[PDB]
Structure formats: C-alpha cells, structure tokens
Design a protein around this ligand. Structure first.
Ligand SMILES: O=P(O)(O)OP(=O)(O)OP(=O)(O)OC[C@H]1O[C@@H](n2cnc3c(-c4cccs4)ccnc32)[C@H](O)[C@@H]1O
Ligand SMILES: [Mg+2]
Length: 856
DNA sequence: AATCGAATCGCCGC
RNA sequence: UGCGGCGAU
DNA sequence: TCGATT
C-alpha cells in the first residue's frame, strides 16, 4: 500500500557514478556529461511517476491484483486455496446432517475460479473500499461468484460454439458494467432459442451471497495467512462486528515489488550526446549504469539473450553504431506549424474543407464506438510527440540509440524517434547537411513527389509533377497556415518539410545546405527478398526488382489477373445449384442456393474489381496469409463497406462472394510470385519437422524431442525461434485472466515471416556499412525497408542499397545455409518427408543495379 | 472422430 | 500474460 | 479451405 521512493538514494547514483561519467566525459566533455546523465536521470524519474500514477488509479479501481507487483503473490497463495476448497468439499460430503448454505453455491464454479475471485475481491476491498467489514467483503465475493456462475454457463455449456460468436464483442466491451449489459442481452437472446436448455437463472438472495463469501474468506485464512480476522465489541449484541485486515508481511511484498518495478521501467528520451557504442550485449545506447540496461537484442527470455554473448558478429555491431551516430535535429519550421494547428484540430490533417438493418445499425454503432476511442488514443500520442519535439527543439543535435529484435530488425529506443508516424517523421531532420548540388535537388523533388502519393509513376513524371505544382509549393512554404494544400497530401507534414527545403533551394541556389532525409522505400521487401533467393523473374518484376517500363503495381497485376478469370467465368462458369445445410444448434436442414461461378463473376464485374480489392491480401502474403485469410479480408475491406454505403446490391450472399474472391486472389498471387509461395512452404515444412516430438507408437517413447529452429543471416547475426506455450491458463468472463513445451503451431506460423524479416534486417545493416565505407555517408534514416540520407548522399545510398542486395544473394544461398543448420537434427523417419530445395529460376541479379523502382 | 487455427516492434487503456 | 485501441513496417 | 492437433 505504501511504496518507497526509489529516487531519494538510488536514482542519485547514475549522476554521481565516476566510471559512467568519466568514460563519457572523455569522449564529449564534462558539461555535456552532466546534461546527458541528468536527462537519463529524468528518464528514470518520469518512468517512476508512470508506475505510481498507474498503481494509484489501479488501487482506487480495485485492480491491484491486475498489477504486476501482486502477481507473484497470487502464484504462490492460490494453489493453497484450491486445495483447501477441494478438501472442504470432501469434508462436508463425509459429514452427516444438513449441508452448509455455501456448499451448493460453490460447486457451480470451477475450483480454481473460486480461488481467484476471493483473493482479487479481498484485495480490491482492502485497498479501495474503505470498509474492512467481513459482511461487506463477503457479499462482494458472492456477487462476483454469482456473476461467473450465471454468465459462465454461457461459455461452458452447449453455447461454447455460440460463445465463440459472442466472445469478441464481449472483449470489445470496456468496463465490467458494459460487459455485464452485453451478457444480459446475450443470455436473454439465447433463452429465446432454448440454447441454455431453457433454464433461466434464479438470482441468489442477499443472505446467500454473504454465506458463500464468508465461507470463502475463512477458507483463505485456513490455507494462507494473507488475511487476518479481528472482532470488535464482542459480547455486545448491538455493536458486535468482525473486521478483516491484510497481513503486513504480504503488504511489504507487493510494496517492495512495486518499488522494484518502478525503477525498472524508464521513459526513454533522446540523447544530447552521441550514443554509447555497442561493444557487447548490454550497456550500449545510453551511457549511465542504470537499473534497466539496454539489450542489444530484445528477447523474451534472458537465456535467449545470453546466447548472443559468444557470437562474433563484427559487421552487426558496426552497423548499429553507425546508425546511432546519425545526428538528428528538430525541424523548427514544421514545429512552428504543428504547434498552432494541433491547438485548433484534434488531428491536424483529418478534416480540411475541400471542394439486416438490425445488424447493420449495430455495426454502425460499433464503428462510432471504435472511432471515439481511436480519436482519444491518437491524440494522446500526438501531445507526447509534440512536447518531446518542443523539448529538444533548441538543441543543436540529438541522437537516438538503436538495438534489434530477435529477428535482427533494428529499432530506435527513445519513445520519440524517427521511426514514428508522419508528424513525428516531419518534426525530425538530420543535423549534418551538405550543399545540395544538382543531383541532390533532383532527389529532393523525387522525395517530394513520393510524399504526395506520386510514387506509382516513373521518375521524369515525378519531376514534372513537382515543377507543375511549383507555385503551390512556394505558397505553402511562405505561409503554411494560409495554404492548406500541403495538408491534403499523402504524407502532409513530411511534404511540408520538403516544401521548406524546396523554397530554400529556390532562394539560395544549388549551394543551399540541405539536411532533409530522403527516403527510399522498397515496394514489397518480403517478396523482393524471396524472389531474390529463388531467382524469380516474374515475381521480381512484379515487385520492381527488374528494370521495368513503369512502376510495377503488384496489387494491380493481381487485380488484372483476377479480372481475366472473372471475365472467363462470366462466360463459361458454373450455374447456380441448390444445396442443403443445417445449423448444428437449430438442428434443422434448410435449402439455400449456392451461387455458381458465373453468377459470382457477374456480381464482381458489376462492383468493379481494382487494386483496392487485392491490396491487403498481397501484403499479408509475407505474413502467412492464404485463401482462407483472404475471405475475411475482402469481406471486411470491400464487401461490407460497399453494403453499408448503398452499394453491395450485387452481393446477395456476401460470404459466397468473399470465398469466391479469396479463391481468385490466391490463384492470381500464387502464379504471379511463385518463389514467395514455394519458399514459405519449404520453411514451414522445415519448422514442422523440427517442432514434432518423434515417438515410436508401440514404445510411446520419444526418439527426438521438440527442436527449435535456428539460422544465421548473411550479416552474421544468429537468430533462434523458440515459441513456447504455458501449460495451464484460466480465464474469467468479467474478471481478467491470469520449463515449458515448444508451441509447434506458432513455430510454423512464424518461421517464414521471421526468416524474411531477418533477411531485410541484414540487408539494412549491410547497406548501412557499405554506404558508410565505400561512400562517405554518415547520416542514416532507417525504417526496416526505408533508407534515408541527405540529398547530397541520396544518389550514393541509391547505389549502395542495390549493391548490397546483389552482393548478398550472389554470395549466399540462405535457404541452403538454412538446410545445413537443421539437417543434422532431423529424425530418420522425417528425412523422407522433407521437401527438397525449390528450383532456382532465370533471374539475373545484376539487373537490380539498373532497376529504378526497387528502391532497395 | 472431433476440433482448431489460420509476422515483428512500440505507445496507451483495462 | 491476456484483451481493447493507436502507430510503425 | 485444409491439413494438423487433441
Ligand atoms: O496505397 P498505395 O500507395 O497505392 O500502395 P502501397 O504503397 O503499397 O500501400 P500504402 O497504404 O499507401 O502504405 C505503404 C507504406 O506504408 C508501409 N506499410 C503500410 N501498411 C503496411 C503493412 C500492413 C498494413 C495492414 C496489414 S499489413 C505491412 C508492411 N508495411 C506497410 C509500407 O511499407 C510503405 O512504406
Ligand atoms: Mg502509398
């Protein structure tokens, strides 16, 4: 209940410690040392305040058991509670005579749930309610017990399949009362169908709700010493009451843990000196010896991190330190614009003045509810980014530490960082610029065209777009508030940043010093990498790996292929037929028309199929999506928005149209990018064979335990895949739910997306070192697929990102290297089942050097 | 037989 | 952890 | 749709 302040004797260490001060004062001076270490002192200070504010509000709301400081307390006490409730059940059954009142109520709820609801509600009542009476907390236990018994029978009983239809809207409800009002209208709806056996709940009375709680409190006192019984004015019939007090030893446990956790989570701020170079696993980035040291790899387990101690990966270490050394500064010009517009609009860009009815009304209401929370969540992120940009505005330069995820993608550590949204990217620019020159001016206009959404057109048409709109750009630069043209663009704040740089070149000529980050973003890198490994000519051209006519739109190509089979099916497709299907719950066979492919093609041609229908399906292919996943997508992306808007009259049966759409998209994407589909199948089959435990059926004994998946990337960064699952988990309807084996399903669902994400991270890192050593590039803007630098270095980074990818896949067969990692661990019975390596195609990688639109 | 499930990271909230 | 929402890729 | 889990 009362937590020590860490800052008084412990946060003072990081400012006074001589070794962190000296090692950083040696590099950059004593005065910057006191500023940087005070900034990190503030970083832990605001983080401590975040934990205390959350804990105080959780204490008031009764959600203290949901806080992480109470969690290890719950883990130890609660096995004792389930055994004590299970032992008392057998005691009463052995005893003759009438049962206690609480006995019949207790059996309706699962034994481990009885354990939970008592502890949390006793914690909730002892930390917030100000009433320590036994009677008041027993009724709170029993009322929450009657909740899980009455509405948990929907989840447990013959509605479990139907509960899978009501669970997500229950999860979308925020607050226990809102989750309650939804469960009441659900329960009445199901009773109208006889789904609960027609048995309506008889509400427990107030005397019954106390008896379940009283038996539950004293059963916690028998099992655990958490909670202690006291009597006041005993022997007086008018004033005899019993109170309940939380045990002091358990109070100090959560208080020490809450204090320990508060010093462990700091709010990461940018660095006013260049960040600490990484020499090992830990201690990089920020300079102080803090309570939470930065890890080079963000891992879930410490053991997965300590696997990185011995690996010699010098090129990985060099690339992270080069990215850290990139000097950034706040764009003051766009900050002046952003500081005034956000006062007037909740979102600066959202609203600019410019020239089944039962179910559809619920869906419209759910959109307004989702839009309302989306608005408040979007705004609070904006106010933090603006206050960070205002805080570091006056500094001549700021820096961002970098580390990596377990796949090797590199991320900035500060909460305000250049891998953020458009406004945050707009507020940030590089600090060390050079005179722009003719070539830099060319790429500055190309970057300006990309910010406007003119990325689908060749480079000369991008230049002509800028020069045609020359007067609009200078009008926006001179007065951004008077001309809202820049805000109507695809990347508005980043476009406004281009406008200021474009105006300065017009004012100061080609000698103008420009430090804007000019971003080159790969089109679809997962397919781009996959087509490079297996030499896919057709797939590579679709993702602009080949020098092409125009920019190749893979979404348009798939939509074009879809429209080919659509027109073929409208002529020679199947006719409609009548099929019989039954709901399992209703148990009644009904006859409905199954539309043939000729009718479904006519529906889709009437709607008009463009790249928008095929867009989301192509992106999710690298994440493992297939035909079934596309059906949900095209229903919610295209069919349902059409239906609500007055269109969708062609989609008489929307699920049959969506499934037909999903089949056509999958047939189109599989023949467009064949190496992508083939490679993710081969990786999935590999993780399949390793993640199985191989037992002979007769002996029932393992011949090969469950095996993780490990590969090393061309950079030299090792990566293991170690998806593990807990054995037991427990979930309540109105209350929050709270070694181990390998999750075989997660190993396959993740192997292909993580392998290709590990491939782009190496390519990003190898690009960074190649651009820094072969060319003179010192400033890098990196977002996974995006490569940014100053305009004077833009042409060289254009070459370096191509040169690294050609040099990588000409030197390494990463799939063959992947095979040599796991071939020894394969069981002998699994060897015949393994698919062979996919066949290499006729693609020449040297054409990537001549490809304009790969960008990567 | 019956059933189940169709990428990573960060912030905020419960 | 889980769930809700936001953002990045 | 589609094979793997349970
Ligand atoms: O609209 P078009 O311009 O015509 O076509 P696209 O340029 O291809 O798409 P767009 O919407 O404009 O945003 C593209 C820009 O944001 C990045 N980006 C946006 N969304 C994603 C996603 C997914 C979102 C939902 C499921 S997965 C996954 C990886 N990267 C993404 C892109 O990496 C690019 O940088
Ligand atoms: Mg776009």
């Amino acid at each position: 209940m009362n937590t020590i302040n860490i800052a008084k004797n412990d946060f003072s260490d990081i400012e006074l410690a001589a070794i962190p001060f000296n090692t950083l004062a040696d590099h950059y001076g004593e005065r910057l040392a006191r500023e940087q270490l005070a900034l990190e002192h503030e970083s832990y200070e605001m983080g401590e305040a975040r934990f205390r504010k959350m804990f105080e509000r959780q204490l008031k709301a009764g959600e203290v058991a949901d806080n992480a400081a109470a969690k290890p307390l719950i883990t130890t006490l609660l096995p004792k509670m389930i055994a004590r409730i299970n032992d008392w059940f057998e005691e009463v059954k052995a005893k003759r005579g009438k049962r206690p009142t609480a006995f019949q109520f207790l059996q309706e709820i699962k034994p481990e749930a009885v354990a939970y609801i008592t502890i949390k509600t006793t914690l909730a009542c002892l930390t917030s309610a100000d009433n320590t009476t036994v009677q008041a907390v027993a009724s709170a236990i029993g009322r929450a017990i009657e909740d899980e018994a009455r509405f948990g029978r929907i989840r447990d009983l013959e509605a479990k399949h139907f509960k899978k239809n009501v669970e997500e809207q229950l999860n979308k409800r925020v607050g226990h009362v809102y989750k309650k009002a939804f469960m009441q209208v659900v329960e009445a709806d199901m009773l109208s169908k006889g789904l609960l056996g027609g048995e309506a709940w008889s509400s427990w009375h107030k005397e019954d709700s106390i008896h379940v709680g009283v038996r539950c409190i004293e059963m916690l006192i028998e099992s655990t010493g958490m909670v202690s019984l006291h009597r006041q004015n005993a022997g007086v019939v008018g004033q005899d009451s019993e109170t309940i007090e939380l045990a002091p030893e358990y109070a100090e446990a959560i208080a020490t843990r809450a204090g320990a956790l508060a010093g462990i989570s700091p709010m990461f701020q940018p660095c006013v000196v260049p960040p600490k170079p990484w020499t090992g696993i830990t201690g990089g980035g920020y300079w102080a010896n803090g309570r939470r040291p930065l890890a080079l790899v963000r891992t879930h387990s410490k053991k997965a991190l300590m696997r990185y101690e011995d690996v010699y990966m010098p090129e990985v270490y060099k690339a992270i330190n080069i990215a850290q050394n990139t000097a950034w500064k706040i764009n003051k010009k766009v900050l002046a614009v952003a500081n005034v517009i956000t006062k007037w609009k909740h979102c600066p860009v959202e609203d600019i003045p410019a020239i089944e009815a039962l179910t559809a009304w619920k869906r419209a209401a759910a959109a307004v509810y989702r839009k309302d929370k989306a608005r408040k969540s979007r705004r609070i992120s904006l106010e933090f980014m603006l206050e960070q940009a205002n805080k570091f505005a006056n500094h001549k330069a700021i820096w961002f530490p970098y580390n990596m995820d377990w796949r090797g993608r590199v991320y900035a550590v500060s909460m305000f960082n250049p891998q953020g949204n458009d406004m945050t990217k707009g507020l940030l620019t590089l600090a060390k610029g050079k005179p722009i020159g003719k070539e830099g001016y060319y790429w500055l206009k190309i970057h300006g065209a990309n910010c406007a959404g003119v990325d689908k057109v060749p480079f000369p048409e991008r230049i002509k777009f800028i020069e045609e709109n020359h007067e609009n750009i200078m009008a926006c630069a001179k007065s951004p508030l008077e001309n809202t043209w820049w805000a109507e663009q695809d990347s508005p704040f980043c476009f406004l940043a281009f406008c200021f740089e474009y105006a300065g070149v017009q004012h100061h000529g080609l000698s103008y010093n420009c430090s804007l980050p000019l971003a080159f973003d790969g089109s679809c890198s997962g397919i781009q990498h996959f087509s490079a490994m297996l030499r896919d000519e057709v797939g590579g051209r679709a993702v602009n790996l080949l020098p092409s006519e125009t920019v190749q739109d893979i979404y348009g190509i798939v939509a074009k292929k879809v429209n080919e089979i659509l027109q073929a099916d409208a002529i020679n497709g199947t006719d409609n037929e009548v099929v019989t299907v039954t709901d399992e719950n209703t148990g009644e066979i009904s006859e409905k028309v199954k539309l043939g492919t000729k009718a479904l093609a006519g529906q889709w041609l009437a709607y008009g199929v463009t790249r928008s229908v095929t867009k989301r399906s192509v992106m999710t292919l690298a994440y493992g999506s297939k035909e079934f996943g596309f059906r949900q997508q095209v229903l919610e992306d295209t069919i349902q928005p059409a239906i609500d808007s007055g269109k969708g009259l062609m989609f008489t049966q929307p699920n049959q149209a969506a499934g037909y759409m999903a089949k056509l998209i999958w047939e189109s994407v599989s023949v467009t990018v064949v190496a992508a589909v083939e490679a993710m199948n081969w990786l999935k089959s590999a993780a399949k064979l390793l993640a199985a435990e191989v037992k002979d059926k007769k002996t029932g004994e393992i011949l090969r335990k469950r095996c993780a998946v490990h590969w090393v990337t061309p950079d030299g960064f090792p990566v293991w895949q170690e998806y593990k699952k807990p054995i037991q988990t427990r979930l309540n309807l109105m209350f929050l739910g709270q070694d181990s084996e390998i999750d075989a399903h997660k190993q396959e669902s993740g192997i292909a997306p993580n392998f290709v994400h590990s491939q782009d991270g190496s390519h990003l890192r190898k690009t960074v070192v190649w651009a820094h050593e072969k060319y003179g590039i010192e400033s890098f803007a990196l977002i996974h697929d995006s490569f940014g630098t100053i305009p004077a270095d833009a042409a060289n980074l254009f070459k370096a990102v191509r040169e690294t990818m050609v040099d990588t896949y000409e030197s390494c067969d990463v799939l063959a290297d992947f095979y040599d990692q796991f071939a020894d661990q394969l069981h002998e019975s699994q060897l015949d089942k393994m698919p062979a390596l996919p066949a290499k195609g006729n693609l020449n990688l040297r054409d990537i050097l001549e490809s304009d639109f790969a960008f990567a």
